[PDB]
Symmetry: D3
Subunit: 335 residues, 6 copies
């Protein structure tokens, strides 16, 4: 493989299907989508925009935190487990958080939570999500060792903010997190930023990554799954929004960020790599949405399995390789 | 049966299908929806949000008033009949109202009409609908003995108003009507109210029923079909709207209102009972709409046949029981 | 006088100032405006848009109900008294209503109230105002014999409604009230309607009077002071709004409506008769507002003294005559 | 045939399917829609709203200019060719214009272009489209002799403008073009106008054709394909928009305009003739869109083949006849 | 003088006041503003944004076209005359246009007209203004020899357009006009364009001049008075808009444009040269407006007398020199 | 005095005027307002919302940081000095920041800055203001020893944020700062928050203080001047906004916050203490604004001098005492 995967994991059991010969795209879709239907739970209205990592437990080889919207249309997080990454056993009830320190007992009352991102850092799995603080969106922060008990920390930022995503290691001695300053509704703007922290409590040294650019991402953008570390830099899949007369179209693509100053863009794919086109992507609670919150990467082979929300209704899977993505991103770069 | 139907009728021939073994919901859909397609009439663009009652005539055992939008997209009402309550003979031409009294000849010039509700009271059938007065929406009123000739009365209210639904009898010697103060557009608010009238012409004693509460009903709510009198109070199905970045999503559920002062809420289901999920509910003239304007109730058995509009395009049917709905409403009550 | 005053009152002591010789307008302003400053009460932020009638008491020859906004910006009504109609003794505290019947003790909790209109009808003074029902604007109704105790009745209409103004007698055996369907905000539309009532409780036979027409009144209109009965019909001063790039401009003019069917417009002045031009009219809490809620009329001379709110800040006075206004209205009529 | 085709062409080889016997519409769809799928080009996100004419080349009997949006969602024009007018060979790369005159070399830099209309006039083919002048929409103008090389002329108008459509010959010695004054976004309005030019460069004598009228066309309208000269006058299909709570619905119909002064409406169909009802019309990048930019007409038989964008995603075809459309328009005429 | 005036006139009688000693601005106000108050005519609500040129008549040495809004708030044009350029005799009644050619007899129905600009070209005075065509704003065109009879020509453009201003001679054989593409309301955008015409009827070769830039002009810009020819090129005062939370703030400044291609900016002043600061500029019908539609220039000395609308209420005057404006524009230039 | 000032300073020379006998308000205005006119600098368009502290230098006994908007309407910070705190010597040119550490040389390029707040903490003066990061509003931080050289630090937060105000000492060993999450425009919402930092670089432990509550403050609130430490807790003046049909009205009041956890409100005045009422508060660049950013407090007497911006045009002064404000806050407390 041309590009190397750095600080990765060997994943011979990664969910995978080979690219079809007729496929002329960088990314191809699993052929039995969705992998998680809207009604997998007795209480679920929809299940989408969800987080997935390798994890060995008694219930399989992968664990996750899943956004579940229930039949009240409350937004919640559920832990799940899978043997193959495709058929998922999702907890019937929501994650109920324990506070990590007593100092957040008063502040961190549960209201809602959605679009989780999860990555392993040094000794535990960190979770970020869009968390309500006084019914305002901000980035909630927690950790888990086992995906059974979850320990909530301080919200990283003031409202209004969404799409908080952690880099999977420290950079120049600090935790680094993507976020995306928003407003109190269906935000008509959005640039990606990073913020930095020595301790995962206090945040600062905020840095602008990039804003809307090409037509398919003209309205707003945000981070998607965990950044993937490569010899080229951080490979970061992100969503971008086009506004039609009838609303938003959510597609996603990738960029490559500088390894040590990840707010500096090296490459940025001018085209989307996947866009809402299939019936489960176009029809549903929110039409025309393909929204990636996790990927698995087999460092041995460069194989990527992408988890993405479809029409805010279900979870689907798509496939590609690091080499394919990096080559396309570099040869089809914006600015 | 646990909950008793009051002032009901015996409907052994109620359209009905049993609840599928796999169905884990309170309400289940007819397995051959829609029962009335957008194009059933030579002139119709769409047929939805419609009123049905038991009524014996030369053309069947049920009758109704149907919302038919033509190929000008004008909004009209057509009378209709059916032997089984599923396969419908809808008049090709619109209802042309006669004035009940000569003193409304000037005022009640036809503009448009939609979303009728119909119920028998003491000696005739009363029809309410969203009626244009000077091209502004208010609640039209009419009566019929035979669903052949319709006699229009005074509009009950000033604009702007919609979702006017009559209680099926007098309460404390007064006619009682659900309505829903609106605006001149696609109203971004909506609470349910009742108004009262001794003579069906002059209205007063307005009482606030309830407003938007849970997420699925957070933007606006409105009355649906005719209230059902039970031993628990008035069982009222109603619609509720959630607003996404792309538009409105219309679901429905139910509440129980006090017998004597129906504006007082006893129970209110925190969850929707049916939401737009099938292709014919999510795809059409207006995406993601499931909008109930009528139910048939078999007082003997407690079986319910619900008629609801789908995507503002067609009419579908769904089934449940009084006991099942009452149980769920009470066990999952809001406030 | 060419036009007669019908069912009027002899008012030789009417506040009055002769037309300045340089004045070329139909209506002319009192030369010492405002007659009531924003800070006349210790608690008042502003006092405007208020109702005034003749009334013999211990504190004068005139009484009224005054909109007073306090230093919380709460909207309230205060009774007031005056010897001359110009210098007012306004109660420091709000009217706290008694319910006329116990059946409204639950429903009529006090939220806010503003823009009162008052007229004598047969045996008492009736008051209408924009009354909050569940924090939504509608028309409150009350009566008083002495401006010391006020007895509140049922809100006449559902929300959202404002500018409810009573005709000062029954017409065709019914009470008749101007109102003006609105929305939940700074309403960007508005037509005048009337509704009718046998008993001041239940309302119906809603009739459209007129909507926005000339430029100065292009955005919305509404009833101003009590209708004045005249041998030409009902002389009705009303307000009209023009919308600039910077907000609203409130002017007022007059129309003449049919004596027997008051929703039928006979004449309607194409020009405004007064608009925001003085510093106390253009500067204050709400710029560019001249808003009439009361006139005094001397039936003997046809002299009219007009009370109007200025910039939602103070109350001012203007003068004109029935003959002057009627002639100008007739010679400069729209449709 | 009852209505004669004037200055038309003989097209025995026009794409054609007969009207099915069950069919109760003026216009029936091709039974294997869409005829050009979204993914026919390796780089295409969507292909829709396209222009087509008879033209004999080495690659077929028809040629065209196609709107292609790429995987950047850039909006572009591609030349295309076809033997049967149904299966299309579309150039993989965009048209790169050459300037007709040196004087536009600085001015006409390529930004974007979409929704072309093309007709032969006198000695060449004229192309109009919505062209970006400094990223503002106006009407681009070009000609071609061979659909290989395209020569760009002056933008006909100032922004903001769209739906520029040439009449297929001079009228009273002047070129005449439909356009449609717009704004900088998803325009919430739109009336049809014509403009006139002695020389295809300077434009004037602007005349208002018509504006929004019936419910299906109540938000805005705009020209569709090239006007068809007939014995009744100019037969012009146009699109009309209805606004629902979730967005826009594009349908199309026809009007007949005066032969000598085409801004004068002679007949205008009150109903649409085709609206979004099929899955490929209702689901796609922009839901609920049927948008015509081209028709073929066989003057020998009166047969019409219509090309129309579906859901801004694909190109579809429909059929009708001149006599059928004309007859329906006349018998169902607006004003 | 340092900058020469080209093709100017000798105006020793130009209205004038020397710059006060304490003044630190490039432009200083006349010390008895306004020169035309809102009520100068018996029917006027306001008089502002008006056009002025040298012209010898029986009524003085200056003539003008004045925007007069009446007490209907109709927008009109009145011709006027002055001996000194400061005190004005304005016609009581509106200009009633005569059609230059029979061909515009049907098109040009009077609706409204505002903000005229006027200049002499070769043999007559040309008048442009914002003219209603079917109640939509575009640029009206007329000429006059004596300011008594006014001959209307074709509207130069389609709606929606405003701020049409002619250059006072042909450039490269063509008439050249500023305009400013707008929308159907209080336009939240605006770039200056020019358009060119061989004959004052057909327009083409549209070029972008410039758009909003600095903070004071960040919302929108538009041409002001007639361009002034200098040895530096075309000296052009334009207005610019800042949007606060309460509305728009209209100031004006100046740019210098290329003599041969006036759409090319040579210099543009980063600061405004005048903004709303006096009581008569900040208070009135539209707050915070200083809007220039005319200047007089004495070519012999470089003195400029600026006429400008204040608060859309009255007409004021300000003074400056060509050398001062030029020096300041060049030394404080944007881009 | 009844309420003790804690950690205050002796300030015998505080600017002061006694309360007029006729004054019935808690706060009275300086009798020669404004103390700083809009045109005090040769380049200033307006000077308002400004910061002031006791500081002995060669130019006086008080120093400050002033918001100056220039004739470009750029927003800037200028240093200034006063002998008496009323008459000010304001530096003609903006503050050009030096970076505290080299590591912000790249990020902290100057865009704009406004509404500074300044307080002395342990050994230096700290300055917060609304600072542009990539032309988006956030909170800038800097410090100074002499008000001659200013050292910029890291922006405390991500956009979008405004009204950053430091508490004047550490609390539980952490810096505490008010802020107010905003959006990209004229924010139509706003709650007060605090954030905490061990080092003035990294921020976290965000706590919600309070949101809009009373009518005068119904649209949004934000912190005003530096908190004052008293025996009741933290006396904090703050601004709140009412939205009328013509825009915003900015008033201010005071609340009392818990000593140890200042996000917990102890008292909150229901009324405003000062609102726009004078000509210089109601007329100017932004009508109806009274906006406090600094107070001087004489601990020996409890006299308070308040600096506040008027109509975003000038700086004014007002007077009150700690005892007067605290007593009124407690006895007129909200929740
Ligand atoms: O907004 C005042 C300035 O704007 C422009 O025109 C107005 C016009 O007076 C009228 O209000 C119309 O309805 O709307 C326009 C505002 O959009 C300017 O060209 C000028 O007239 C005004 O100073």
């Amino acid at each position: 493989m041309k590009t190397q995967i750095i600080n990765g994991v060997s994943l011979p059991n990664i969910p995978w299907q080979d690219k079809p010969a007729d496929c002329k795209d960088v990314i191809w879709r699993y052929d039995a989508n969705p992998i998680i239907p809207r009604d997998q739970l007795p209480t679920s209205n929809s299940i989408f925009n969800s987080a997935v990592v390798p994890y060995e437990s008694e219930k399989g080889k992968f664990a996750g935190v899943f956004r579940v919207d229930d039949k009240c249309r409350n937004m919640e997080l559920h832990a799940g487990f899978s043997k193959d990454g495709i058929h998922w056993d999702i907890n019937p009830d929501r994650i109920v958080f324990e506070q990590a320190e007593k100092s957040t007992e008063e502040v961190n009352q549960w209201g809602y939570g959605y679009d989780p991102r999860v990555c392993f850092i040094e000794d535990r799995f960190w979770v970020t999500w869009c968390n309500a603080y006084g019914w305002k969106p901000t980035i909630g922060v927690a950790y888990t060792f086992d995906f059974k008990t979850f320990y909530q920390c301080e919200n990283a930022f003031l409202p209004f903010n969404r799409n908080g995503v952690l880099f999977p290691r420290k950079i120049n001695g600090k935790y680094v997190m993507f976020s995306r300053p928003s407003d109190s509704g269906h935000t008509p703007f959005g640039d990606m930023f990073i913020s930095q922290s020595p301790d995962m409590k206090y945040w600062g040294e905020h840095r602008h990554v990039m804003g809307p650019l090409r037509a398919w991402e003209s309205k707003k953008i945000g981070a998607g799954p965990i950044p993937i570390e490569t010899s080229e830099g951080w490979l970061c899949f992100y969503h971008g929004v086009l506004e039609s007369c009838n609303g938003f179209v959510y597609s996603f693509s990738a960029c490559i960020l500088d390894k040590d100053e990840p707010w500096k863009v090296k490459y940025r794919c001018a085209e989307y790599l996947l866009s809402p086109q299939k019936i489960y992507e176009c029809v549903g609670d929110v039409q025309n949405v393909t929204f990636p919150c996790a990927t698995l990467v087999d460092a041995d082979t460069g194989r990527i399995a992408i988890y993405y929300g479809c029409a805010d209704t279900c979870v689907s899977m798509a496939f590609t390789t690091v080499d394919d993505v990096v080559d396309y991103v570099k040869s089809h770069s914006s600015v």
